[PDB]
Coordinates of C-alpha atoms in Angstrom, one line a residue:
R1 CA 50.6 -31.7 3.9
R2 CA 49.5 -28.0 3.2
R3 CA 49.0 -26.1 -0.1
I4 CA 50.3 -22.5 -0.6
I5 CA 48.6 -20.5 -3.4
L6 CA 50.9 -18.2 -5.4
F7 CA 49.8 -15.5 -7.5
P8 CA 52.3 -13.8 -9.6
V9 CA 52.0 -10.5 -11.8
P10 CA 52.4 -11.9 -15.2
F11 CA 55.3 -9.7 -16.1
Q12 CA 58.9 -11.5 -16.2
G13 CA 59.9 -9.4 -13.5
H14 CA 57.4 -10.7 -11.0
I15 CA 57.2 -14.5 -12.8
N16 CA 60.9 -14.8 -12.2
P17 CA 60.9 -13.9 -8.3
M18 CA 57.5 -15.6 -7.4
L19 CA 58.4 -19.1 -9.0
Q20 CA 61.8 -19.2 -7.5
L21 CA 60.0 -18.9 -4.2
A22 CA 57.5 -21.1 -5.2
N23 CA 60.2 -24.0 -5.7
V24 CA 62.2 -23.0 -2.0
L25 CA 58.6 -23.7 -0.6
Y26 CA 58.3 -26.9 -2.3
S27 CA 61.6 -27.9 -1.1
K28 CA 60.5 -27.6 2.5
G29 CA 57.3 -29.5 2.4
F30 CA 54.2 -27.9 0.7
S31 CA 51.6 -28.7 -2.1
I32 CA 52.1 -25.6 -4.4
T33 CA 49.1 -24.1 -6.6
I34 CA 50.0 -21.3 -8.9
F35 CA 47.3 -18.5 -9.9
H36 CA 48.4 -16.9 -13.3
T37 CA 46.5 -15.2 -16.3
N38 CA 46.5 -17.0 -19.5
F39 CA 48.7 -13.9 -20.7
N40 CA 52.4 -14.3 -20.7
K41 CA 51.8 -18.0 -19.2
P42 CA 55.2 -19.5 -18.3
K43 CA 55.9 -23.3 -19.8
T44 CA 54.3 -25.6 -17.3
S45 CA 56.0 -28.5 -18.4
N46 CA 59.2 -26.6 -16.8
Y47 CA 57.3 -27.1 -13.3
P48 CA 56.3 -30.8 -13.1
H49 CA 55.5 -30.5 -9.6
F50 CA 53.3 -27.3 -9.5
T51 CA 49.6 -27.6 -10.2
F52 CA 48.7 -24.5 -12.3
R53 CA 45.4 -22.8 -12.4
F54 CA 44.6 -20.1 -15.2
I55 CA 42.3 -17.3 -14.1
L56 CA 40.9 -14.0 -14.7
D57 CA 41.3 -14.6 -18.7
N58 CA 39.8 -18.3 -19.6
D59 CA 37.4 -17.0 -22.1
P60 CA 54.5 -1.2 -21.1
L61 CA 50.9 -0.5 -22.4
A62 CA 50.2 -4.3 -21.4
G63 CA 50.7 -3.3 -17.8
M64 CA 47.3 -1.6 -17.2
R65 CA 46.1 -5.4 -16.9
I66 CA 47.5 -4.7 -13.4
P67 CA 44.5 -1.8 -12.3
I68 CA 41.9 -3.7 -14.6
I69 CA 42.4 -6.8 -12.6
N70 CA 42.6 -5.0 -9.0
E71 CA 38.9 -3.8 -9.6
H72 CA 37.2 -6.3 -11.8
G73 CA 39.1 -9.5 -10.2
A74 CA 37.8 -9.9 -6.7
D75 CA 34.7 -11.9 -7.5
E76 CA 36.7 -14.4 -9.7
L77 CA 39.8 -14.7 -7.1
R78 CA 37.3 -15.7 -4.4
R79 CA 35.3 -18.0 -6.7
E80 CA 38.2 -20.2 -7.5
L81 CA 39.7 -20.0 -4.0
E82 CA 36.9 -21.3 -2.5
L83 CA 36.8 -24.1 -5.1
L84 CA 40.4 -25.0 -4.3
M85 CA 39.7 -24.9 -0.4
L86 CA 36.5 -27.0 -0.9
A87 CA 37.8 -29.6 -3.1
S88 CA 41.3 -29.6 -0.9
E89 CA 41.0 -33.4 0.9
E90 CA 41.0 -33.9 4.6
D91 CA 44.7 -34.1 4.2
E92 CA 45.7 -31.0 2.4
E93 CA 44.2 -27.9 3.6
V94 CA 45.3 -24.6 2.2
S95 CA 47.8 -22.7 4.8
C96 CA 47.8 -19.7 2.9
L97 CA 47.9 -17.4 0.0
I98 CA 51.2 -15.4 -1.4
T99 CA 50.6 -12.9 -3.7
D100 CA 52.6 -9.8 -5.7
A101 CA 52.0 -6.6 -3.8
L102 CA 50.4 -5.0 -6.8
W103 CA 47.5 -7.5 -6.2
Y104 CA 46.4 -5.1 -3.5
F105 CA 43.0 -6.3 -3.7
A106 CA 43.6 -10.0 -2.9
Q107 CA 43.6 -9.1 0.9
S108 CA 40.0 -8.1 0.7
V109 CA 39.3 -11.5 -1.2
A110 CA 41.4 -13.2 1.3
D111 CA 40.0 -11.1 4.4
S112 CA 36.7 -12.0 3.1
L113 CA 37.4 -15.8 3.0
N114 CA 39.4 -15.7 6.3
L115 CA 42.1 -17.1 4.7
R116 CA 45.7 -15.1 5.5
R117 CA 47.7 -13.3 2.6
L118 CA 51.5 -13.1 2.6
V119 CA 53.1 -10.9 0.6
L120 CA 56.2 -11.1 -2.1
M121 CA 57.8 -7.8 -2.4
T122 CA 59.7 -7.9 -6.0
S123 CA 61.2 -4.7 -5.3
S124 CA 63.5 -3.3 -2.1
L125 CA 63.0 -2.2 1.4
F126 CA 64.1 1.3 0.0
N127 CA 61.5 1.3 -2.7
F128 CA 59.0 0.4 0.2
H129 CA 60.5 3.6 2.0
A130 CA 59.9 5.7 -0.7
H131 CA 56.1 4.7 -1.2
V132 CA 55.8 5.1 2.7
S133 CA 56.9 8.8 2.7
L134 CA 55.1 9.8 -0.4
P135 CA 52.6 12.0 1.6
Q136 CA 55.6 13.5 2.8
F137 CA 57.1 14.0 -0.9
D138 CA 53.5 15.6 -1.8
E139 CA 53.9 18.4 0.6
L140 CA 57.7 19.7 -0.7
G141 CA 56.0 19.0 -4.5
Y142 CA 58.5 16.4 -5.4
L143 CA 55.1 14.8 -6.8
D144 CA 54.6 18.2 -8.5
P145 CA 56.3 18.0 -12.0
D146 CA 55.3 21.6 -13.4
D147 CA 58.3 23.7 -11.5
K148 CA 61.5 22.0 -11.4
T149 CA 63.8 20.0 -9.1
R150 CA 67.0 21.3 -7.6
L151 CA 70.3 20.5 -9.0
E152 CA 72.0 17.3 -7.3
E153 CA 70.0 18.3 -4.3
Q154 CA 69.0 16.1 -1.3
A155 CA 65.1 15.9 -0.4
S156 CA 64.8 15.7 3.3
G157 CA 65.3 14.0 6.7
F158 CA 68.4 11.6 5.6
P159 CA 68.2 12.1 1.7
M160 CA 70.3 9.0 0.5
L161 CA 67.9 10.0 -2.7
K162 CA 67.4 13.3 -4.7
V163 CA 64.5 14.6 -6.1
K164 CA 65.2 13.3 -9.4
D165 CA 65.0 10.0 -8.2
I166 CA 61.2 10.4 -6.8
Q167 CA 60.4 12.9 -9.9
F168 CA 61.4 10.2 -12.6
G169 CA 60.6 7.2 -10.1
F170 CA 57.3 8.7 -9.2
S171 CA 56.5 10.4 -12.8
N172 CA 52.9 8.5 -12.7
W173 CA 51.5 11.8 -10.5
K174 CA 49.1 12.0 -13.7
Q175 CA 47.7 8.9 -11.8
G176 CA 49.2 9.6 -8.5
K177 CA 49.4 7.9 -5.1
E178 CA 45.8 6.5 -5.8
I179 CA 47.5 3.4 -6.4
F180 CA 50.8 3.4 -4.3
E181 CA 48.6 4.4 -1.5
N182 CA 46.7 1.1 -1.6
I183 CA 49.7 -0.9 -2.3
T184 CA 51.5 0.5 1.0
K185 CA 48.2 -0.1 2.8
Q186 CA 47.6 -3.6 1.6
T187 CA 51.2 -4.4 2.5
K188 CA 50.9 -3.5 5.9
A189 CA 47.3 -5.0 6.5
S190 CA 49.1 -8.5 5.5
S191 CA 49.7 -11.6 7.7
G192 CA 53.1 -11.5 6.4
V193 CA 55.9 -10.0 3.9
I194 CA 58.6 -11.7 2.1
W195 CA 61.2 -9.6 0.9
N196 CA 63.4 -10.6 -2.3
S197 CA 67.0 -9.6 -0.6
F198 CA 69.1 -10.3 2.5
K199 CA 70.1 -8.6 5.6
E200 CA 73.2 -6.9 4.9
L201 CA 71.7 -5.7 1.5
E202 CA 69.6 -3.1 3.2
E203 CA 70.0 -3.1 7.0
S204 CA 69.4 0.5 7.0
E205 CA 65.7 0.2 5.9
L206 CA 65.1 -2.8 8.5
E207 CA 63.8 -0.4 11.0
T208 CA 61.6 1.0 8.6
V209 CA 59.8 -2.4 7.8
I210 CA 59.9 -3.3 11.5
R211 CA 57.9 0.0 12.1
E212 CA 55.2 -0.2 9.5
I213 CA 54.6 -4.1 9.3
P214 CA 52.9 -5.3 12.6
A215 CA 53.1 -8.8 10.1
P216 CA 56.7 -10.8 10.3
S217 CA 58.5 -9.8 7.3
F218 CA 61.5 -12.4 6.3
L219 CA 64.3 -11.6 4.0
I220 CA 65.1 -14.1 1.6
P221 CA 67.6 -13.8 -1.6
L222 CA 66.0 -15.9 -4.1
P223 CA 68.7 -15.8 -6.8
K224 CA 71.1 -17.2 -4.2
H225 CA 68.6 -20.0 -3.7
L226 CA 68.2 -21.0 -7.3
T227 CA 68.1 -19.5 -11.0
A228 CA 64.9 -18.4 -12.5
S229 CA 66.0 -19.6 -15.6
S230 CA 62.9 -21.7 -16.4
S231 CA 60.3 -19.3 -16.1
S232 CA 61.7 -17.2 -19.0
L233 CA 58.5 -16.0 -21.0
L234 CA 61.1 -15.8 -24.0
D235 CA 63.9 -18.5 -25.4
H236 CA 67.2 -18.5 -24.4
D237 CA 69.7 -18.3 -27.2
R238 CA 72.4 -20.3 -25.4
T239 CA 75.1 -19.6 -28.0
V240 CA 76.5 -17.2 -25.8
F241 CA 78.0 -19.6 -23.4
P242 CA 80.6 -21.2 -25.6
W243 CA 81.9 -17.6 -26.6
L244 CA 82.2 -16.2 -23.1
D245 CA 84.5 -19.1 -22.1
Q246 CA 86.7 -17.7 -25.0
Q247 CA 86.4 -14.3 -23.7
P248 CA 89.3 -13.5 -21.2
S249 CA 88.2 -13.5 -17.3
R250 CA 86.2 -10.1 -17.0
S251 CA 86.3 -8.4 -20.2
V252 CA 82.6 -8.6 -21.4
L253 CA 80.0 -6.4 -20.3
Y254 CA 76.7 -7.8 -20.1
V255 CA 73.6 -5.4 -21.1
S256 CA 70.4 -5.9 -20.4
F257 CA 67.3 -3.4 -20.2
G258 CA 64.5 -5.1 -18.5
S259 CA 61.5 -6.8 -20.1
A260 CA 59.4 -3.9 -20.9
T261 CA 61.7 -1.0 -22.0
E262 CA 61.5 0.5 -25.3
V263 CA 63.8 3.5 -26.6
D264 CA 63.9 5.6 -29.7
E265 CA 65.8 5.4 -33.0
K266 CA 67.9 8.4 -31.7
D267 CA 69.1 6.7 -28.5
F268 CA 69.4 3.3 -29.8
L269 CA 72.2 4.4 -31.9
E270 CA 73.4 6.4 -29.2
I271 CA 73.4 3.7 -26.5
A272 CA 75.1 1.7 -29.8
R273 CA 78.0 4.1 -30.5
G274 CA 79.1 4.5 -26.6
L275 CA 79.6 0.6 -26.5
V276 CA 82.1 0.6 -29.3
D277 CA 83.5 3.9 -28.2
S278 CA 84.4 2.1 -24.9
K279 CA 86.6 -0.4 -26.5
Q280 CA 85.4 -3.1 -24.6
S281 CA 83.7 -6.8 -25.3
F282 CA 80.4 -6.4 -24.5
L283 CA 77.4 -9.2 -25.2
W284 CA 74.3 -6.8 -25.5
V285 CA 70.5 -8.5 -25.4
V286 CA 68.0 -6.6 -27.5
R287 CA 64.3 -7.9 -26.9
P288 CA 62.3 -8.7 -30.1
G289 CA 60.5 -5.1 -30.4
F290 CA 62.9 -3.2 -28.1
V291 CA 63.6 -0.6 -30.6
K292 CA 60.7 1.7 -31.8
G293 CA 59.8 2.3 -35.4
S294 CA 61.2 -1.0 -36.1
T295 CA 61.2 -4.7 -35.3
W296 CA 64.5 -5.7 -33.8
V297 CA 67.5 -3.9 -34.5
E298 CA 67.5 -2.9 -38.4
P299 CA 68.8 0.6 -37.1
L300 CA 72.0 -0.9 -36.4
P301 CA 74.5 -0.3 -39.1
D302 CA 76.8 -2.5 -40.6
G303 CA 80.3 -2.4 -39.8
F304 CA 79.9 -1.8 -35.8
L305 CA 82.1 -4.0 -33.5
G306 CA 81.5 -7.4 -35.1
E307 CA 84.6 -8.9 -33.3
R308 CA 84.2 -7.5 -29.7
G309 CA 80.6 -8.4 -28.8
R310 CA 77.4 -9.9 -30.2
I311 CA 73.8 -8.8 -29.8
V312 CA 70.9 -11.5 -29.1
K313 CA 67.3 -11.8 -28.4
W314 CA 67.3 -13.0 -24.8
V315 CA 69.7 -15.4 -22.5
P316 CA 69.5 -16.8 -19.0
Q317 CA 71.2 -14.0 -16.9
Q318 CA 72.3 -15.3 -13.7
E319 CA 73.8 -18.0 -15.3
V320 CA 75.6 -15.5 -17.7
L321 CA 76.4 -12.9 -14.9
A322 CA 77.7 -15.9 -13.0
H323 CA 80.4 -16.4 -15.8
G324 CA 83.8 -14.9 -15.6
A325 CA 84.0 -13.6 -19.0
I326 CA 81.5 -10.8 -17.4
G327 CA 83.2 -7.9 -16.0
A328 CA 80.0 -5.6 -15.3
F329 CA 76.2 -5.2 -16.2
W330 CA 74.7 -2.5 -18.0
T331 CA 71.6 -2.8 -16.1
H332 CA 68.2 -0.5 -16.2
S333 CA 68.0 -0.9 -12.4
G334 CA 65.3 -3.5 -12.5
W335 CA 65.6 -4.9 -9.1
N336 CA 65.8 -8.6 -9.8
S337 CA 68.7 -8.2 -12.6
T338 CA 70.0 -5.6 -9.6
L339 CA 69.8 -8.4 -6.8
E340 CA 70.9 -11.0 -9.3
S341 CA 74.1 -8.9 -9.9
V342 CA 74.9 -8.5 -6.1
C343 CA 74.4 -12.1 -5.4
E344 CA 76.7 -13.3 -8.4
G345 CA 79.0 -10.3 -7.6
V346 CA 79.3 -8.0 -10.9
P347 CA 79.4 -3.9 -10.7
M348 CA 76.7 -2.4 -12.9
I349 CA 75.7 0.7 -15.1
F350 CA 72.7 2.2 -14.0
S351 CA 69.5 3.8 -15.8
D352 CA 66.0 4.6 -15.0
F353 CA 62.7 4.0 -17.3
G354 CA 60.6 5.3 -14.2
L355 CA 58.9 3.3 -11.6
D356 CA 61.5 2.2 -9.4
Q357 CA 64.8 2.4 -11.2
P358 CA 65.9 5.5 -9.9
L359 CA 65.5 4.6 -6.4
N360 CA 67.2 1.4 -7.1
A361 CA 69.9 2.8 -9.1
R362 CA 70.7 5.5 -6.2
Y363 CA 71.3 3.5 -3.3
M364 CA 73.1 1.0 -5.1
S365 CA 75.2 3.7 -6.4
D366 CA 76.1 5.5 -3.4
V367 CA 75.0 3.6 -0.6
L368 CA 76.4 -0.1 -1.2
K369 CA 79.0 1.6 -3.8
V370 CA 78.5 -1.3 -6.5
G371 CA 78.0 0.8 -9.5
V372 CA 77.9 4.1 -11.5
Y373 CA 74.6 5.8 -12.3
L374 CA 74.2 7.8 -15.9
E375 CA 71.8 10.3 -14.5
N376 CA 72.1 12.6 -17.0
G377 CA 70.4 10.9 -19.7
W378 CA 72.6 9.1 -22.7
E379 CA 75.6 10.7 -24.1
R380 CA 78.1 8.7 -26.3
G381 CA 81.1 10.1 -24.1
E382 CA 79.7 9.5 -20.6
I383 CA 78.3 6.1 -21.1
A384 CA 82.0 4.9 -22.4
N385 CA 83.3 6.8 -19.3
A386 CA 80.8 4.7 -17.3
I387 CA 82.0 1.4 -18.6
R388 CA 85.6 2.3 -19.0
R389 CA 85.4 3.4 -15.4
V390 CA 83.9 0.2 -13.8
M391 CA 85.6 -2.0 -16.2
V392 CA 89.0 -0.8 -17.1
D393 CA 90.0 2.7 -15.3
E394 CA 92.1 2.4 -12.1
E395 CA 89.5 4.8 -10.4
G396 CA 86.7 2.0 -10.0
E397 CA 88.6 -0.7 -7.9
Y398 CA 86.5 0.5 -5.1
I399 CA 83.2 -0.3 -7.3
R400 CA 84.5 -3.8 -8.0
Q401 CA 85.8 -4.4 -4.5
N402 CA 82.5 -3.8 -3.1
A403 CA 80.7 -5.3 -5.5
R404 CA 82.2 -8.8 -4.5
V405 CA 82.4 -8.1 -0.6
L406 CA 78.7 -8.0 -0.6
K407 CA 78.5 -11.6 -2.4
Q408 CA 80.7 -13.4 0.1
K409 CA 77.8 -11.9 2.8
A410 CA 75.1 -13.2 0.7
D411 CA 76.8 -17.0 1.0
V412 CA 76.9 -16.1 4.6
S413 CA 73.2 -15.5 4.6
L414 CA 72.3 -18.8 3.3
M415 CA 75.3 -20.6 5.1
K416 CA 73.5 -22.1 8.2
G417 CA 73.3 -19.7 11.4
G418 CA 72.6 -16.5 8.9
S419 CA 70.0 -14.2 8.6
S420 CA 68.4 -15.9 5.3
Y421 CA 68.9 -19.3 6.7
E422 CA 67.0 -18.7 9.8
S423 CA 64.6 -16.3 7.9
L424 CA 63.3 -19.2 5.9
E425 CA 63.3 -21.9 8.9
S426 CA 61.0 -19.0 10.4
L427 CA 58.9 -18.3 7.3
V428 CA 58.6 -21.8 7.2
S429 CA 57.4 -22.1 10.7
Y430 CA 55.3 -19.1 10.2
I431 CA 53.4 -21.3 7.1
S432 CA 52.9 -24.6 9.0
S433 CA 52.0 -22.9 12.7
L434 CA 48.8 -21.6 11.5

């Protein structure tokens, strides 16, 4: 009997994957302790088989906890580790810790303890290519936002990307590679690295991973394993499932934009019209506090759709995406939502609110070819001409085709004698054989 220590980052896009992995690992035999701040704590009654430890705070702007924890957490993380290693019975040794990547400082703490740390990568191999070649991007001044980026113009080497992708996708040059420097470092210094993906999804970046990571990396599509429904930090309105049933097959555009994202009153209305203008049935989730200078959706006028679509606060998305009523998904190019998509097999409109969303958008658009990327902000014509495109237009059947070829591949992964299948037997072997 052997304990894994997991340690998410307490934001939905990190919780979601980290606990899915937790569930898959309990399956295969391991005791499971979870480190988590008291901030954004998930519902624990949902996870009766996991032991939970709250730390670091036992008495978009919220994402500063990450850097604040990194520098000031070390000595608190080490304490609780040692506690847990101590109290552990003769017959329940801790095999390993498994953190988010952004916990780049656990590796010193673990190092200091001699415990070995594995890493959960909540974004893609491509993402991690980007960060690897960042000192290559400083040179060309892609990280410089003073002058300009060239028009639909390829960066360097084998540029599946463009300079905008990086420009906006690394639009925190104000802080700079100071952070990402270590994340990449602290990924490579690791005893292993679990990728939320499968082998056909990113086969070009395998090399990038097998080059830079001396430790074995293991390729694991979590959504295909199990749904992340019971780590939702917000309450699901399930009143959408009885509806969808009464939409005809593939006539609903799902529309989620992350768990953090904010928009102006101007754009929210803009986003609004485009959806009507497209003349399609669409379920559109809107967080509580999504629109700025408002609480929920006061900005919405009366007499917009009403029959075709309905707004909601929050839903169990994977469960949604898997409904036939679904035809596409207006993502924000967050990775889980993006990955969920491929695995349930739905084509997507893209967007980017920085960080990683262009990167994701880019090589989901062009490489795989499973979506349409509004590069150029928000126009009520374009948006409707992306949605019509993917959904109705006869000029996106190659989008719809590819978006479901890739799904069968995923099932094949998890079918015995398949990448993901073997990767999990291996990961499992890699945890035990320690």
